[PDB]
Amino acid sequence: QRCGSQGGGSTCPGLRCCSIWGWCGDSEPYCGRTCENKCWSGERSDHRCGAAVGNPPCGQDRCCSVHGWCGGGNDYCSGGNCQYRC
């Protein structure tokens, strides 16, 4: 859906990346070089995520677990184990 500067200012459902064209998605054109907000380059240096730290993004192929950390794999990215960017 629409987001960011071109899209009306919304944040994406599931905290996905917003591209510079104002659309949400989860691959390179949204999250990498042409990303506007909630980008892969925006993961905290402490790897924390979730509402206590303001729902920051996780990096490439990393998801935010229900425990509150970004990581790769089933532990972080699978159904029940993952809160956002799954």
How many domains, the chain?
1
3-state secondary structure at position 40: helix
Q: Are the beta carbons of 58 and 70 closer than 8 angstroms?
A: yes
Helices in the chain by DSSP H: which ranges?
A: 4-7, 28-31, 74-77
d(CA 39, CA 86): 14
d(CA 30, CA 28): 5
d(CA 74, CA 76): 5
d(CA 53, CA 58): 12
- Technique employed here was X-ray
Give the domain range for residue 79: 2-86
Q: Are the beta carbons of 81 and 74 closer than 8 angstroms?
A: yes
